[PDB]
Symmetry: C11
């Protein structure tokens, strides 16, 4: 099986008034290993995490070329065990094809069904292991772009 867990971002906005950009890089503590012993296995069949990220097709969202989502797993304390990084790219469409998309699919979009989202999927620990039997408590995921608009984020951990 494979249980997900929601990701909730935050960022400070201590600084002054901007135009549209944020003030810092959006980080997120995700949490895992809840009160029951149902977590990443001791030496299980190896894991394939994917950060199922969500994006709308804003014009602003469209401009940003690439942004790398990193990760770091912590164990007990401020104790990193493994890091990674994956660049990712918002999946491009032309302008004429967006006009034909919002004109052909005008029957679905005007009634709630399958709204204009473009949900990504970026795997970043293909064949993950948990060595030396120190338990992985959670992760600190972090995207490095001050100008990004995203609804929410899921984190699939998955077996094989």
């Amino acid at each position: 099986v494979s249980h997900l867990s929601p990701v909730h971002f935050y960022y400070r906005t201590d600084c002054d008034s901007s135009t549209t950009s944020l003030c810092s890089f959006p980080v997120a503590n995700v949490s895992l290993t809840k009160g029951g012993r149902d977590r990443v296995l001791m030496y299980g069949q190896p894991y394939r995490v994917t950060l199922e990220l969500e994006l709308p097709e804003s014009p602003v969202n469209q401009d940003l070329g690439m942004f790398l989502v990193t990760i770091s797993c912590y164990t007990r304390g401020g104790r990193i065990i493994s890091t990674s990084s994956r660049s990712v790219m918002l999946h491009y469409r032309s302008d004429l094809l967006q006009m034909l998309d919002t004109l052909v699919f005008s029957s679905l979009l005007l009634f709630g069904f399958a709204e204009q989202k473009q949900l990504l999927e970026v795997e970043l620990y293909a064949d993950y292991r948990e060595n030396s039997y120190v338990p992985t408590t959670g992760a600190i995921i972090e995207i490095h772009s001050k100008r990004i608009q995203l609804y929410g984020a899921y984190l699939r951990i998955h077996a094989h």
Copy 2:
């Protein structure tokens, strides 16, 4: 059951004349635990608060990418017991689809029925508890964007 309570914002505007933006971050004391003992339970079935927020599709409102709504529960005095934060995103639509929306639904919008609102819903204490039996008097909710246009706000506290 689940009773709501209205949220009334305020902000200072002590400063000089702006273009369209506000002068500070819109905060709000909500109030709870009224004269009858009908409040957040002692150790009840756990709570799921949602801040049902209201937004119109202004152009100005549309530009702002993300804004994080925070919360802080106070007990007796200036005594925080729990905080949180959720980023949230105004739900995007394209311009051609807005033209088709205000052209197809021209029979409903010109007669009061289901006007151009885009009411959000952002849960921020999924499975809330009230530990150590100090009573929660109310909350101080606060959105961190000086440029935001919103009608009103409800605060569902809800059981399971």
Copy 3:
């Protein structure tokens, strides 16, 4: 029953020539408790005041995002007894829907019937009381925006 009373604004304009904005915040002494003893009751059924405010759909009027209307009740002298504040928002419409509004309703608007007004209503003492039996003489209502265009204002005090 429920008697209203008209509100007449004023503001100084001592300063130099502006473009369109005013010179100070529009305040207004409303007056109550006239020569007969027909005023806010001693311990009556509690009151629900609404400041029925009037606005035209100017472009200028449309730009302003939010503005908070405050209130302060005075008793005898410069003696405040209760204050409040409510932010309020001019009720948004798109531009294409305004073109369809002034095109579909061209039979009513060209003959005086139901002209292009957008009268607000903002309650600000839902369940008002008059405690310690000091009489409320009137109110000082005040909107905090130097750039606002409004015809007039009524003040419903209402029973239950």
Copy 4:
């Protein structure tokens, strides 16, 4: 009955060449209590003055948001007895409705009948009295906007 009296404005224009604006605030001595004893009564049925003001729909006239017309009644010498103030607003119309107005009513406007005026009416001593039996000689009415275009002005004093 109710007799009116015409109002004739003046203002100095001592200053240099402007673009379109005036040089000072348009004041006007109106005059009353003529050679026969037909004036504001001693203790009559109380009065309701209205300053029936006249305005054309210039673009320039349209921009100005609000302007407060004041008043001051003088008795014998430079002796004020009563003052007031009323803000007033030029009654708004959209641009598309002005095009439909000057297109639908093209049969009346091209032959003199009911030309493009927008005559206001602003009451400013609803239930006026004349106390202590010092006679009111006239009034000094005054509008506080250097940029205003108006044909003429009548001053209804009216009984009940």
Copy 5:
């Protein structure tokens, strides 16, 4: 009966080259009490002078909002006996109505009949008297706007 008399303006233009404006305020000595004793009567039926002024609808002429025409009557020497002042306003029309005016009335305007003039009429001594039996020789009429285009001017003195 009522005899008129033509008014001939002048102004200095001593100053340097302007764009379109004049150099000073257009004044005019009108003259009266010619070689026969046919002038303003000793104690006649009282007079109502009107300065029938002439204006074309030039764009430059159209911009100017208000201008006050004054007057001063002289007796024998530089001896004023009476002054006045009346603001006056060029009678407004919209642009679409000017297009319909020069399109509908294309049969009259292209053959000399009733050309595009907009002759004003501004009364400024309604019920004029000539007291103390010092004879009024003439008048010095004067309009206070450096940017005005006008053909000519008549001065009706009229009986009752």
Copy 6:
């Protein structure tokens, strides 16, 4: 009878290169009292001079609002006997009416007949006399605008 006489202007152009304007005010000595005794009479029936001036409808010519044509009659030497001044105005037409004028009258204008001139006529010694029997030799006529385009000028002296 009434004999005319042509007027020939001149002006210096000593100064540097301009855009379109002239360098000084266009003056003109006209001449009269030729070798035969046929001139302004001794005490004749009084005269009415008109300076029949000629103007084309150039855009540059059209902008100029008013210009005053003066006059001065000289007798023997540099000896003025009488002066005057008349403001005058180029007779206005709109742009749409000029398009209809050059479109409707396209049969006359393309073959020489009645070309696009706008000849003025400005009387400036209505009931002229020649007192003290010093003979009037001629006149010095002069228009005060550095930016004016005119073909020629006739000077009617006329009897009654």
Copy 7:
């Protein structure tokens, strides 16, 4: 009879590179009294010279408002006997009439016949005499505008 003589202009262009304008005023020695005694008569029937000048309707040529062509007759040496001056004006046409001119007359202009010239004619010694019997050798004609485009020039001397 009446013999003409061609006029050939020249001007220095010593100065630096301009945009379109010339460098000095175009002067021209014309020459007369050739090897046979056929010149301006001793006391002949008086002469009427006209400088038949030639102009194309270039836009640059069209802008220039007025320009005065002068003249000076020389006798033997640098010895002026008579001068004059005539202002002259390029004969105006509108733009719509130029479009109709080059559209209606498209059959003549595309085959050489009567090309787009606008030849002037300006008389400048109407009733010329040759007094004191000093012979007039020729003339120095001169137009005072640095920005003028002209093909050629004839000089009619003519009898009566």
Copy 8:
């Protein structure tokens, strides 16, 4: 046979907020010679590596003219054995042909099939050898353009 291996880029973004460009050159450690002895052969049939690179037709992506992808093979430690370099060019199309491409292929692109990618292929060790029998552990591939948008990258090693 021929096994591929995925390439994952990274780059620092330590620097401040840019417009669209990156902060450094995108490098990538690829890895090879896994836990089984299936790697580049000792003296095998020689190899032909191709870096199958992926690009979308973004306007930003389209501007960049050429960019050289380099390579360096490392053995054991920071020990380069072989380098290369190949310039490469995004395969050009005109704008009218892109409009015809997204109009003709509108049936395939609106349903997921064969989306607007332009996957390159650039061979850079045509006839590769592994001399002196020091094993090649992996490669450090690197493209030298700070402004490039690319999804992913495969690295074919291939036999003959």
Copy 9:
């Protein structure tokens, strides 16, 4: 008879890079009196030289208003015998007539026949003589405009 001779221009271009203009005035030694005694006659029937100049209707070529072509005949050494000067003007056409010219004559211009040239002809020694019997070797012709585009030039010497 009348023999021509080709003219070959030159000019230095020593100076730096310009936009379109040349660097000096285009001069040309033409040559005459070849090895046979066939040149300008001793006292022949007098000559009429014309410099048949060639011009294309380039926009740049079209702007230049006038340019004077001079001449100087040399005899033996640097020995001028006669000079002249003629201003000349490129023969004007309007823009609408150029569109009708290149549209009506589209059958001739697209096949080589009578291409868009505008060959001038400017006579500059009408009735030329060769006095004192010093032989004229050739001429130095010279046009004074740094911005001129011309193909070639012929020089007709012609008898009568």
Copy 10:
């Protein structure tokens, strides 16, 4: 026979971020005389090398007027034996003809066949010889333009 050999360019890009241009001139070592004795002959039938260069019709590529491709043959060491240079020009087309090209050939271009390339061919050793019997190892070819977009390059050496 005639064997070709591929050319692989490189250039440094050490410098900072440009707009579109490169950082240095694109040079290339080509290599020849491989492990078998099949190279440029001792005294063979003479050679005709052509550098078959490849170019796309970018707008950017189109602007560059001329660029000279040079060459230098090296023998053993840094030892040049022969150099050359040929300017070359991208083969021009108009814009309307490019629109007709990508519209008429829309059946071939949308399916891979004969894509929008413009492959040049520039011979630069027509009748090449290899004198003094020092062997030519290869060549260093080099194009001198920092702003050029090219896919690849072949180098035909060819016999006769």
Copy 11:
């Protein structure tokens, strides 16, 4: 007979990055008198060289007004024997005629036949001789414009 010989230009481009212009004047050594005695004759029938130059109709090519191609023949060493110079002009066409040219001839231009070239021909030694019997080795031809786009150049030497 008449043999030609190809001309190969070169120019330095040592200087920095330009926009489109070159860095120096394009010179070219042409070469003649090859290994067989077939060159310019001793005293042959005289020669007529033409430099058949090649030009495309770029917009850039079109702007340049005139450019002079020079020549210099060298004999043995740096020893000039004869020089010349001819200005030349790119043969003008209008823009509307270029649109009709690339529209009418769309059948020839889209298939390779007679592409958009405008090959010049400029003779520069009409009746060339080779005096004093020093042999002419070749020529150094040179065009003086830094902004010129040309494919190639032939040099006809021709007999009579």
